[PDB]
Design a protein around this ligand. Sequence first.
Ligand SMILES: NC(=O)c1ccc[n+]([C@@H]2O[C@H](COP(=O)([O-])OP(=O)(O)OC[C@H]3O[C@@H](n4cnc5c(N)ncnc54)[C@H](OP(=O)(O)O)[C@@H]3O)[C@@H](O)[C@H]2O)c1
Ligand SMILES: Cc1cccc(Nc2cc(Cl)nc(SCC(=O)O)n2)c1C
Length: 316
Amino acid sequence: MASRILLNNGAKMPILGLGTWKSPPGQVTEAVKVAIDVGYRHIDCAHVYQNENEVGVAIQEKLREQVVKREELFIVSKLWCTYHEKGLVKGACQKTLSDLKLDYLDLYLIHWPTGFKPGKEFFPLDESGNVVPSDTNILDTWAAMEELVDEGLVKAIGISNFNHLQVEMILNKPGLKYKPAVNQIECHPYLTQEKLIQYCQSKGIVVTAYSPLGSPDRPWAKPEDPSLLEDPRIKAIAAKHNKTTAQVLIRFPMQRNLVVIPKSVTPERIAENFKVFDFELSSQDMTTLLSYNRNWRVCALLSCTSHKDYPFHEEF
Ligand SMILES: NC(=O)c1ccc[n+]([C@@H]2O[C@H](COP(=O)([O-])OP(=O)(O)OC[C@H]3O[C@@H](n4cnc5c(N)ncnc54)[C@H](OP(=O)(O)O)[C@@H]3O)[C@@H](O)[C@H]2O)c1
Ligand SMILES: Cc1cccc(Nc2cc(Cl)nc(SCC(=O)O)n2)c1C
């Protein structure tokens, strides 16, 4: 198991990163500091997570402490849906760089393929509870992302929550300057993403698996929902390998040549989640975990099911 994966831009992306969605501002600074101390070299961030300033504080402390150099870190952020308009992309990227206190990002992603009306609200809703779209399309937003690479503000650009047709739209864009390096998608034993992973890997696009533990802190969770961390079948695989259920869940995507970004703000769990390079799931273990697929999404963006670019009507 190599600890990094080569991207189509020539850079090496660490296969394990720390997620930061739902990491409250007063906890995330310590979380990122613990993560860097433990050995994480990749942090997944987003403007919409509303904590980039605090992530910035942590990165800067560790750089000043000389625990790491900037070139050893791989920092990802994401363009939020209200900034798809071509003329807003650069400003959004610059606000993120300013919050993170960085001169460049390693990877900047279009967070979702759906553009939302610009303004103060992250999720601008109509009276029916559906998001108000922006008059934007994916290809113009991609061209604005490419300008960030030309200016040196970001080393690589990519996408998140794009279906294969939407990726194909970018790959076939007239005058394409840069291919996406990464597609960041939800992926875990209940949503195994076989077809989309096959597709992406066949195009040289690295896949990053989000919500690998099933996002037990997601705010919309319901008691009837499935729970990976409580699944007795996965606990039995963990018990066999003298590991925790979370560690099994993190190792799983690693053996599929995916990047994985488990989130925690608990120092003991940050450390636990990093101890996944000292064991191997068997061929049978992988086949078994893949069989748990149930097409179940944490993140189904249900307020956008009428949006022209909603990604999840397509099979993959
Ligand atoms: N591109 C996108 O649209 C998108 C969407 C979703 C997620 N993401 C990214 O992917 C990351 C991970 O996904 P996620 O945040 O949804 O969920 P996750 O990483 O699947 O689960 C995080 C939850 O699991 C808990 N946890 C972590 N390690 C654990 C352990 N070893 N034992 C027991 N519980 C543990 C965390 O608790 P504590 O924090 O309290 O320890 C938190 O409640 C996000 O933070 C974000 O960076 C991206
Ligand atoms: C309180 C509130 C109001 C409106 C919408 C949402 N849904 C969110 C919020 C955030 Cl920060 N992230 C997601 S999905 C995670 C992602 O897109 O990375 N969904 C939430 C959590």
